[PDB]
Design a protein around this ligand. Sequence first.
Ligand SMILES: Nc1ncnc2c1ncn2[C@@H]1O[C@H](COP(=O)(O)OP(=O)(O)O)[C@@H](O)[C@H]1O
Ligand SMILES: Nc1ncnc2c1ncn2[C@@H]1O[C@H](COP(=O)(O)OP(=O)(O)O)[C@@H](O)[C@H]1O
Ligand SMILES: Nc1ncnc2c1ncn2[C@@H]1O[C@H](COP(=O)(O)OP(=O)(O)O)[C@@H](O)[C@H]1O
Ligand SMILES: [Mg+2]
Ligand SMILES: [Mg+2]
Ligand SMILES: [Mg+2]
Lengths: 372, 372, 372
Amino acid sequence: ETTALVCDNGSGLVKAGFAGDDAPRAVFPSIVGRPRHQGVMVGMGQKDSYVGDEAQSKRGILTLKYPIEHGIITNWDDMEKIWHHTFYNELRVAPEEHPTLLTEAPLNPKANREKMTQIMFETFNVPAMYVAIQAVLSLYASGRTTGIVLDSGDGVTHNVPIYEGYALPHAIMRLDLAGRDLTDYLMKILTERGYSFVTTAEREIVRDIKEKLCYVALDFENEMATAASSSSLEKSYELPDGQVITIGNERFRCPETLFQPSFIGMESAGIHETTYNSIMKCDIDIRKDLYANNVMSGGTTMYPGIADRMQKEITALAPSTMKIKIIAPPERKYSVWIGGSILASLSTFQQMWITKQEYDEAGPSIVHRKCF
Amino acid sequence: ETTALVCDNGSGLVKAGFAGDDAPRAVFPSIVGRPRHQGVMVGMGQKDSYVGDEAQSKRGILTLKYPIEHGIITNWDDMEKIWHHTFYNELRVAPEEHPTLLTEAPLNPKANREKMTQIMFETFNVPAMYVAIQAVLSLYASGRTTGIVLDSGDGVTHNVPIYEGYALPHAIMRLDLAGRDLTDYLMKILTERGYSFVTTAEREIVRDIKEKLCYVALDFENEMATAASSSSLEKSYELPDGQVITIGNERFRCPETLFQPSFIGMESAGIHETTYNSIMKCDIDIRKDLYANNVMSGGTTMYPGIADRMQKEITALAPSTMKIKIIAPPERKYSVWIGGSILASLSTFQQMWITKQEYDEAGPSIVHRKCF
Amino acid sequence: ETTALVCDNGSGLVKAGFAGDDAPRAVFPSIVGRPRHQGVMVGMGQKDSYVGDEAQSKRGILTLKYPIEHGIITNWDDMEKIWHHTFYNELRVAPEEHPTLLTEAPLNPKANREKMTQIMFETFNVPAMYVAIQAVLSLYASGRTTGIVLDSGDGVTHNVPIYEGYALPHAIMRLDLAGRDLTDYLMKILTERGYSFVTTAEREIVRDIKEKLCYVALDFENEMATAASSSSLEKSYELPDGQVITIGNERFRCPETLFQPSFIGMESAGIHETTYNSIMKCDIDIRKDLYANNVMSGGTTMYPGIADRMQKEITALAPSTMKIKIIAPPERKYSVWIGGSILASLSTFQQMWITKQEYDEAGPSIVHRKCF
Ligand SMILES: Nc1ncnc2c1ncn2[C@@H]1O[C@H](COP(=O)(O)OP(=O)(O)O)[C@@H](O)[C@H]1O
Ligand SMILES: Nc1ncnc2c1ncn2[C@@H]1O[C@H](COP(=O)(O)OP(=O)(O)O)[C@@H](O)[C@H]1O
Ligand SMILES: Nc1ncnc2c1ncn2[C@@H]1O[C@H](COP(=O)(O)OP(=O)(O)O)[C@@H](O)[C@H]1O
Ligand SMILES: [Mg+2]
Ligand SMILES: [Mg+2]
Ligand SMILES: [Mg+2]
């Protein structure tokens, strides 16, 4: 009768909530803020660390640290503070009477999963847990059983193909280019017009400009010629100190790094060629079902016009006799968590939990035996 | 008096030299490098393409491409540059006064042989050339006239049985599993410990780790239990940036792919079962000589302990009443070239060249009538 | 025959002269002074503006303005007067018969470059003009073709890595902390001893104290304990009004802001961590030629003992098994100009000038196409 806690601990945001729902209960950025100046006024609850939204609102006097870098946890006390805040302050539930479902990027280091096991069973100890792959949860949320997943979050962009219920681990591709790299590239190219941003409190502003003002160009050279020709593609955004900024071609030079990674010095191919090479690394007889079931998920797949560009590039790459259909649901931003809300609700899933007792015999190594 | 040129065009390395020698004169990787960044300094011989050791030493600013993949030439301008470099810069000879010996994997497409014919008679035009099968050259280097040759290089792995001078073309097996796939699998399994390698300049480093630290386990499960029990099978390697890495079971998980191709999602059987099925696709009365003269050659047969594992697996597969001998010469890495240094020096061979006037009479198609 | 005019327009000083020389002909501060009081004596050539050393000598009755702050030109009439004084009074040459070389900080706004081009081609119109990056000129002056440059001046501190003639623009780092902020921090800490300095005529005096009495401490806490223990680190300087001042620990507290930017409220990392993070933002293979060729140039890298502190911090940051070399030429204060005297004298450079007819063909937009 105890509900399961689905907790997607992504690189930029945390989506935590109960199983069986439609939307995540607590969505908050995964930052830990610490005071950087000196305190003069005595009293009024001057905490030494702020986690989440109060770190976001008080960000002018705080240095912000992300505990997760490219899907890998680096600072463990900060991630412990993140888990404590999302268990006791957001969901307001006791973790010792609820199973927990966690997500993990493919091709992660093993010690990351082992330390999640050790912390989750020795500090916020649970009756049981499970660790799942995010792309499988995306196919849960889409409702299909076949297709290839382009899941691009804040640190990790990965392609996973699954045909008729079976995963293909030899064609899973991973690229470390995601929305934090696009935020840094927007920070680099915003100095062309004179707008200088340095601090992490300015990184949040640059992230807000990236979410509210950027879109994917359909044709790159035609859009650059249109931007250089007439002044009709410039938008204005108001900073929190009152200055207005006006940006032009930088609206579509930021998400073009997703298709051309050579802008930031990476010699890897674009995500369209990554998807095409991941499809051609599979068996030949299943490629027809993979072309018609392109499913994307994540926060950086919500750009305006990315679906038409993806369709055009894959249609150029694929032979002309085949049907390529791109699936972009309007609720992809939480769809991985939505898969958790499907996965923990199934009665057949309720035997695959890693129990506390099984951990007590098997040590912190059973999670590679059970969870794939 | 004109010394013939033996030039082994392997998938990863090029071994070129004169006839009659004991060692190849020029051994260099078949890598074409191109600039990937922008150049701000003016002068000092900034070329647009680097070939060989110059591309290997300056690999940090270059995109590295292999012109040969799985024994099939894909890029022809790069392969022409490779031939120009190995004729005019390495061997320092004029190709118009020397006959040429070329090597080729079995079951190759014929258009590869026709285009190398047209190139070697129209751009670096020679008095004559011959194209030979590499397993025949390995059997020449062994000095025997019977036996099965397992030649495994950088792109291909082929088994050819030859009894008393007559090869059996219906029992020739080809597998597309070689050291490039072992390098890619070493990249895939090195992310378990957090060491991420993505670039081709890093792929050379992963190749160096594969050559200097990997070995074939005699028993797989006992070695995995020994690695999980104690940390006595862990070695350390120093990266060029000063960082050190430590690897454990990954020393023997990488070359186990040759015996179990299901690790990388290949459905085909291992190399021992391939040799066994190739031997009893021959006739019954010759199998005693084929079991007693099992010869390996190539760079990926230089793994420490691969011969004992091969002996054990063929001993298990064959009936126990007879003698199975695995012949691994210490110099097998260049032995195909050594076979060329035997074959181009024989006086009986000097009537089997494909001359210039024969090519002009019969087009670029006579290489299928003459060369087998 | 007509030599080029190399004019380093820095934030605090202007270094102008002819191409092919070893030292800059005219080195003068980039200030414009204006009268602030009323004049009762009529005659004697009372100008309404003083530029250069004339404003420096008569600075007691003038308000001094810098036209360039943080490498960005703000006042254009003052910068035009600076250019007119360095063309017609210091160099005493006609600008219409000499090509001009200009220097510019990386990650600069492009409107600065286009207004510089429009002014140089329509007011002091030239046959040709090229704009270069200062770190490239520093590597031209040092004579090598590889290494990372920490170029720190009066407005900007930037790190640029260049390997074998190829620059890496994705690893170029810029920090807006330079000698002006050190001068302001020296004013902020000089009120501890009762010496108050407010005006720009006092800014020149505080700058002179910073140049002739400050040095970089090796170990900060040990020199703080030495200054608090015994009176041995106090120096005396004579002000122009005859008063003497005595300073103690403030000799090394001022240049510690370059290593600890948190003293002036900036949360950015130190310049040693900036160099380290720029080097590990490059590729792995080229880091050995970057640790062995660390070059600095500019005025604020001329502190006593900054090279030893640099070597100690990068030695601590790098792995201990690898050599770090710090290169500080004695003539770094003009070395960027020295690179101009190398760059404009090469015969290979003479085909990359922006001509007058090219500018009239292509507008003021060719300068981003040609000059990187
Ligand atoms: N409308 C939008 N346009 C572009 N990018 C967006 C948009 N909304 C969110 N993002 C990006 O998505 C990233 C986080 O996506 P998400 O996958 O939900 O979180 P996580 O990666 O932590 O799982 C943020 O860094 C943000 O920059
Ligand atoms: N000591 C070694 N152990 C394992 N593999 C090796 C060793 N030396 C070379 N190799 C592998 O052999 C491959 C090339 O073998 P070789 O046949 O000599 O060249 P090619 O295949 O180009 O003819 C390389 O990819 C390398 O990975
Ligand atoms: N001996 C010195 N010690 C410390 N700082 C110095 C010294 N000499 C000059 N400087 C500083 O260098 C700055 C100017 O350096 P430079 O790079 O030559 O000029 P710019 O930055 O205008 O190109 C001045 O602001 C001055 O404070
Ligand atoms: Mg996510
Ligand atoms: Mg070979
Ligand atoms: Mg300067």
